[PDB]
Amino acid sequence: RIRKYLANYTQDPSTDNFYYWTCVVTVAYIYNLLFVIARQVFNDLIGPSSQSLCRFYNNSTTQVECTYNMLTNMKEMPTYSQYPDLGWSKYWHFRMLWVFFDLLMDCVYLIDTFLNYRMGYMDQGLVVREAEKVTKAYWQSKQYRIDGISLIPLDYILGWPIPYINWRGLPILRLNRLIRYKRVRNCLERTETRSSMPNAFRVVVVVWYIVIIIHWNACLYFWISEWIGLGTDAWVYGHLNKQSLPDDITDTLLRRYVYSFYWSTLILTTIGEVPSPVRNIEYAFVTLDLMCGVLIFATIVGNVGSMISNMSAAWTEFQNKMDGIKQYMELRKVSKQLEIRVIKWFDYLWTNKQSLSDQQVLKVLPDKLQAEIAMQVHFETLRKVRIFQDCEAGLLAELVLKLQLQVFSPGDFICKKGDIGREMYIVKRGRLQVVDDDGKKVFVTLQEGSVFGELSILNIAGSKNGNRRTANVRSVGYTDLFVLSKTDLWNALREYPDARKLLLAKGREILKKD
Amino acid sequence: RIRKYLANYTQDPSTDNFYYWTCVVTVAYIYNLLFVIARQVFNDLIGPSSQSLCRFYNNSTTQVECTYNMLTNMKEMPTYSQYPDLGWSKYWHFRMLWVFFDLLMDCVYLIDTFLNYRMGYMDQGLVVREAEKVTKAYWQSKQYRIDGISLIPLDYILGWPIPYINWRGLPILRLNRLIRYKRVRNCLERTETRSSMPNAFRVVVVVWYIVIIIHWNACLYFWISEWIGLGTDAWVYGHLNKQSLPDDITDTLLRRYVYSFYWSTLILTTIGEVPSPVRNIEYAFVTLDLMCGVLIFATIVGNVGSMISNMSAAWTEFQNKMDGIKQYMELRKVSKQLEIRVIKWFDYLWTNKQSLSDQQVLKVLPDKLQAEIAMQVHFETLRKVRIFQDCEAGLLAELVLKLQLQVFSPGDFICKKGDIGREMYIVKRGRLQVVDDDGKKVFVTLQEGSVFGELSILNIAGSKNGNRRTANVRSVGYTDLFVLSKTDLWNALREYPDARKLLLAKGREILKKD
């Protein structure tokens, strides 16, 4: 049953279902961040627990409950009288909605605590899936302290307005759900690997951080502006501030959050077009908040500057290389036709997205993975060279591991008649031809997969010709040859005696064949 | 006794007690910075030496001593009449507190002068601890000039308000204690080595510099605003500035320092929401101060941008390498299963915090320290290979100096049956197994510390097999093998003739044993 399915369960963290679970815990953490500091500071989000009483002149000035016309053009801020049961007779649907979402995110935290309990730790490469072993790995570690502080249910006791003991409600006691930050950091990292664009996702995560810090500073500004007193200064929120409440503007909860977000956006990006402070504690808060805004603006400028300089590094290294050899050509007074040819060759080098390098796979992959990336490209092409047909595959492994890439220009010759031939040519993505001394084509136009110079690698002393090419091979287009020198085949043939005997036999066969 | 303990004392600078002494001299320097410029400019810190006399209308307007109600809503600034003894009858406890802290930091400067006297200079690696030699090293150097200018006691003569000669007191003569900056630079550097995070400590030291420059500019602004005249312009401090003294704000010493700090924070971070200047000398000061604020803001932006770009260099070099070989794979049209395997291998490369490199310890350590970091890892594992048991340790030194690290993938074979075997495998943090041609396990599952291929390194010509593997070795998890080729053991065995005889003897023994 499902009880023994739970008793014999152990989660390993590398699947995609656990990654979607880390997305769910990231959603619950973002909820806990935003709406716990907003329900602490603003407190009309869970329904107003105090009736707003304005001073209204009709007859005489009486004290009556504020309508939306009494909050426009205020001469003084409305005073509050609490309800008997603190907004519970009329905002219970709001509070049951907030209690339902708090219980949903605490159920998400409970299921993440159980997945921390049956969590497969990686021992020696493989993951442990035995239940007692991951249980003792949990209890031997100190994950249960962070799982226990993040699940104290005391917000359900002392976080809602209780009318019987006249408790005003304290929703800052749900800040202990915010120390599950390792799961959100794991979800952001494992999304940053598999993303389509890592630099743009780093910038989107940085502006999500910026919106969260601006929101927390908005709640901090309205808490300080409520603790000092609303409408007592020209800096705090209220009627005496003419930016927060202008002429025909109602004072509502949306106006409070909208002006506090505008204040923290103008302070933390160092624009500062808000009213200047009046008292001393407002000067201390605005000075500390503007120094933090200078550091936040420098963080934004540094992250966007590193995002720009990371994605335009290959282009400026290309410009460094292009300017270096253009400086080398204009220092040495070369003809201009070669300069047209090399700049059109760099245009081909950009429009193929290549860099004349094998060095990235020569460096950063281990030699087994280098062997697999060698075999899944050139092995099926290098089985069809008609001398490597009946041979051992290990020699082919050492040969495909030692292939070299050369790119040619259109109209440019590879090797002329009467040249010291010591290389074998394997054509990839090109078209070669043999030409009868810049006249017509002789016999064949070598397409992709074909081979030229397989006779001048086996080193037969004087059968028909030793090592001369006896061909004028021309590239009609941009051709990407794959060349294998005589030294590499004779090293890999020095490691194989019987294959040396067999390749000498097949070479004498194909050389006495013509 | 303690007098001959002082006569035979010499301090070497590399201990931790001298580092805590440099922290004490840094504390005394920070005191001298902040409170010498604050006691010069503000001057109510040592007690007001002049009675504030407001114009108060009761009857008639009379001139009376200002209360805290007379400094709110001022129509003109209060004029000052000095005391007979200049605040000494009522602020002597404040001045004895300031004199006690000045004598405490000058005692710290005297003990640092004596530790400069008996300071052990480093001659040839070792430190000199002979007393006459460090005494002549002191007097031959010019440390005594900087120690003599930083200890003129003339602030105790002409830095306090003397009533008998009507001296107002000049606490800017204690600025000569500020040229002991080499000790503070040494303490900041030697804290920056041993810190937990060098980039964050560089940023914390930069914002300590920012708070100190903002404080010195606050004292400069209030000195210029006091020299021009308080309350004469709308730019200077006073009643005519409506930002400094608003409606219900008392003019106190805390209001002066708080508004001057707010002014220098808004100017030196180029926000500039302070009142615009009126006269010409205020325009000259605000123009120079805003150009210095542009350079300070560019310094903050440059330091935080270099802090960001230094700590995210390994990640973007990983992304350069990953994008380079992904470009190499998608240029060459490879199957997708190998692409899943290489991206999960880079996920393992990040989650082990490795980079497939020995090159950092191959480069930056000297060869003795490379030998020690070699011997304290692989020597105890390489003593247990059962052929290197009875051998000389120097050959083992040249062998552990030539070990190579290879990482494998789970399910991927190391070497199949019928392969050219020329390497010896030493397992670290992995689990290998021999499999009977992708069937069951044959005999053993090779755990950590075990060795495979120690028979195919000694090169015995035709006893049972020359150099074939005759095993299918599979990694079940991510395995970090340590491999030693035949070329490295035969180079280190070419340097040892008798060890070559002994390893041939033990190799023939273990090869005729089976």
Our measurement of the distance from residue B12's CA atom to the centroid of its chain's CA atoms, rounded to an integer in Å, reads 23
Q: Which residues of B193-224 are buried (b: 16+ CB within 10 A; e: fewer)?
A: eeeeeebeebbeebbeebeebbbbbbbbbbeb
Helices (H) and strands (E) in chain B, counts: 16, 11
Instruction: Count Cβ atoms within 10 A of the Cβ of residue B352 and give its class: 0-12 exposed, 13-18 middle, 19 or more buried.
Output: middle
| Cβ contact, residue pair A313, B334, below 8 Å | no
If phi > 0 it is left, if psi is from -120 to 50 it is alpha, else beta; for residue A169 that is left
Residues making up the binding site of B for 3',5'-cyclic GMP: 453, 456, 469-470, 513-514
A354 in contact with B, Cβ within 8 Å: yes
Question: Is B304 an interface residue toward A (CB < 8 Å)?
Answer: yes
Give the CA dihedral B127, B129, B130, B133, nearest 10 degrees: 40
Q: Minimal CA–CA distance to A169: which of A96, A227, A86, A106?
A: A86
Tell me which amino acid residue A19 is: Y
- Which residues of chain A neighbour B324 with C-beta distances below 8 Å? 357, 360, 364
Tell me which residue of B428, B443, B433 sits closest to B475, measured CA to CA. B433
What Å distances lie between residue A362 and A233, A388, B245, CA to CA?
68, 25, 71
Spatial distance between the Cα atoms of A286 and B256, rounded to a whole number of angstroms:
16
Residues of B in contact with A360 (CB under 8 A): 321, 324-325, 328
CB-neighbour burial class of residue A383 (10 A; exposed 0-12, middle 13-18, buried 19+) = middle
CB B81 within 8 A of CB B51: yes
The residues, any chain, with a CB within 8 Å of residue B449's CB and separated by 6 or more, are: B381, B384, B426, B427, B428
**Which residues in A183-210 are b (16+ Cβ under 10 Å) and which e?**
bbebbeebbeeeeeebbeebbeeeeeeb
Query: Which among A511, A289, A204 is positioned nearest to A387, based on CA atoms?
Result: A511
Rg of chain B over all Cα atoms, to the nearest angstrom = 38
Give exposure, B97-130, as e/b (b: 16+ Cβ within 10 Å).
ebeeebeebbebbeebbebbbbbbeeeeeeebee
- Structure tokens, A511: 């050389």
The amino acid that residue A124 corresponds to is Q
Measured from the Cβ of residue A256, the count of other Cβ atoms closer than 10 Å reads: 20
Select the residue of B273, B308, B320 nearest A303 (Cβ to Cβ). B308
Question: What length is written for chain A?
Answer: 514
CA–CA separation, A390 vs A369, rounded Å? 26
Whole-angstrom Cα Rg for chain A: 38
Strand locations in B117-199, DSSP E?
Answer: none
Burial A216-238 (b: 16+ CB within 10 A, else e): bbbbbbbebbbebebbbbbbbbb
First to last CA, chain B: 77
Interface of A with B in 306-345 (CB under 8 A): 306, 309-310, 313
Beta-bridged to residue A65, according to DSSP, are A53
Sign of the C-alpha dihedral, residues B109, B110, B111, B117? positive
* Region at A78 (left for phi over 0; alpha for psi -120 to 50; beta for the rest): beta
Say if CB B396 and CB B383 are below 8 A apart.
yes
DSSP state letter for B273: -
Backbone angles phi, psi at B484, to 5 degrees: -135, 120
Q: How far apart are CA A235 and CA A204, in angstroms?
A: 32
Token pair for A26: 């990231």
Structure tokens at B394: 């120097």
Q: Which residues contact B315 (CB under 8 A, 6 or more apart)?
A: none
Q: Contact, A302 vs B301, CB < 8 A?
A: yes
- Tell which residue, B49, B25, B21, B31, has the closest CA to residue B174: B31
CB pair distance less than 8 Å for B309 and A313: no
Is residue A426 within 8 A of residue A483, CB to CB? The reply is yes
3-state SS assignment for residue A284: helix
User: What type of residue is B44?
Assistant: D
Binding residues of B for Na(+): 273
Q: Which residues of B touch A191 (CB under 8 A)?
A: none
Q: Do A368 and B319 touch (CB under 8 A)?
A: no
CB contact under 8 A, B341 and A369: yes
CA separation for the pair A346, A354 (Å, rounded) = 10
Q: At what angle do helices A181-193 and A198-228 cross, to 10 degrees?
A: 150
CA distance B187 to B201: 13
Nearest CA in chain B to A287: B262
Kindly report the nearest CA distance between residue B353 and chain A, in angstroms.
Answer: 14
DSSP codes, B187-228: HHHHHHHSSS-HHHHHHHHHHHHHHHHHHHHHHHHHHHHHHH
Instruction: Give the count of beta carbons closer than 10 Å to the beta carbon of residue A181.
Output: 11
Q: CA-CA distance, A43 to A253, in Å (whole number)?
A: 9
Closest CA to A507 of A450, A457, A470, A462: A457
Chain mean position to CA A264: 28
How far does B507 lie from chain A, in Å, by closest CA? 23
Cα A157 to Cα A42, A148, A154, A174, A352: the distances in Å are 20, 17, 5, 11, 66
Quickly count: other Cβ atoms within 10 Å of residue A371's Cβ.
15
Q: Which of A227, A297, A234 is nearest to A268 (CA)?
A: A297
Q: Chain B contact for A124, CB < 8 A? A: yes
Q: Which two tokens stand for residue A406?
A: 């050369």
- The Cα–Cα gap between B278 and B286 comes to 11
Rounded to whole angstroms, how far apart are CA atoms A103 and B102? 60
Cα B343 from Cα B325, distance rounded (Å):
11
Question: What strands lie across the sheet with B451-452, from one edge to the other?
Answer: B404-408, B479-485, B423-428, B451-452
Instruction: Give B443-512 as a DSSP string.
Output: EEEE-TT-EE-SSTTS--TTSS-SSB--S-EEESS-EEEEEEEHHHHHHHHHT-HHHHHHHHHHHHHHHH
> What percent of chain B is helix, strand and coil (3-state, nearest 5)?
50, 10, 35
Show the CA angle centred on residue B397, arms to residues B392 and B399, nearest 5°: 100
Sign of CA dihedral B431, B434, B437, B439: negative
Q: Residue A425: which H helix or E strand, with range?
A: strand A423-428
Breaks (C-N over 2.5 A) in chain B follow: 58
Q: What is the DSSP string of B42-109?
A: T--TT--SEEEEEEEE---EEEEE--SSSSSS-SSPPEEEE-SSTTTTTSHHHHHHHHHHHHHHHHHH
Report in angstroms the alpha-carbon separations of B246 from A58, A278, B48: 34, 6, 24
Residue B490 · residue B402 · CB < 8 Å: no
Which of B199, B212, B255, B342 is most worth mutating to test chain A (most A CB atoms within 10 A of its CB)? B342
Contacts of A372 (CB under 8 A, 6+ apart): B338, B341
Q: Which of B210, B271, B327 sits opposite A270 (nearest CB)?
A: B271
Spatial separation of the C-alpha atoms in residues A101 and A443, rounded to whole Å = 80
